[PDB]
Amino acid sequence: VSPTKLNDLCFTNVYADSFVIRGNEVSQIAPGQTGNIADYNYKLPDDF
Amino acid sequence: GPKKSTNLVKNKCVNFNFNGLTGTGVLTESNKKFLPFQQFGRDIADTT
Amino acid sequence: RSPIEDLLFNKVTLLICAQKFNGLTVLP
Amino acid sequence: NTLVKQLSSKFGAISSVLNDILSRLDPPEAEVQIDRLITGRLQSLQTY
């Protein structure tokens, strides 16, 4: 979704998940990633 | 989102936005016996 | 029309018309 | 009927609706999102 177009759209399912991680771990939060955060802690779907 | 609702216009060609479903056409009333869980309507070739 | 022509017209059977609204037209 | 059914395909794009794609992203990659739809629909028309 475009960052400036989330206002006018209607949304079916919304999920709000909240946690804290380290500075080198933020780039791992992405669809299809490797690493123990992405493999054993929190895995995003491939079509995210 | 926070958008203003508009009163019902009927039997005229009009752009319509029902819950983020953007389209263009004419609105009329029909005797389609929708079941209470049924929201949208479709036919041949999956057209709204 | 003769009875033969009436029988031939009734034998051949010619929502589907509303779905040809995406640039498709049938000329007479 | 096959032409009208084939009109509702994706051809490797994120959606099969032009208005849904156009109200979802910004132009500079919405154009490459819709170029695949263009290629598929020209191929379908030439086959027909």
Q: Quick check: helix, strand or coil at residue A44? A: coil
Strands B21-26 and B13-18: antiparallel
| Chain centroid offset of residue C21 CA | 17
Cα(D33)–Cα(D14) distance, rounded to whole angstroms?
7
CA C27 to CA B39: how far, in whole Å? 36
Q: Other C-beta atoms within 10 Å of D7: how many?
A: 19
Task: For residue C19, give the chain B residue with the closest CA.
Answer: B44
Q: Coil, strand, or helix at residue B8?
A: coil
CB contact, 8 Å: D2 with chain B? Answer: no
Look at C19 and D4 and tell me if their CB atoms are within 8 Å: yes
**CA D3 – CA D19 distance, rounded (Å):** 20
D34, D13, D24, D29: CA torsion to nearest 10: -50
User: Using a CB-CB distance cutoff of 8 angstroms, which residues of chain B are in contact with residue D8?
Assistant: 45-47
- Token pair of D33, please? 């999102």
Q: Are B25 and D22 in contact (CB under 8 A)?
A: no
CA D36 to centroid of chain Cα atoms: 6
Name the strand (E) or helix (H) holding C8. helix C3-11
Whose tokens are 């709000």? That residue is A16
The answer to whether chain B touches chain C by having 3 or more C-beta pairs less than 8 angstroms apart is: yes
Q: Are A28 and A37 in contact (CB under 8 A)?
A: yes
C16 contacts in chain D (CB < 8 Å) = 1
Q: Tell me if there are at least 3 CB pairs under 8 Å linking chains C and D.
A: yes
Distance in angstroms (rounded) separating the CA atoms of residues D15 and D38? 13
The resolution in Å comes to: 3.0
Backbone angles phi, psi at D38, to 5 degrees: -60, -45
Residues B20/B28, Cβ–Cβ less than 8 Å = no
CA–CA gap between residue B18 and residue B22 (Å, rounded)? 7
Give the 3-state secondary structure of residue B18: strand
Pull the structure tokens for residue A13.
């399912």
Provide residues of C within 8 Å CB-CB of chain D: 16, 19-20, 22, 24
Determination technique used:
cryo-EM
d(CA A10, CA B13): 23
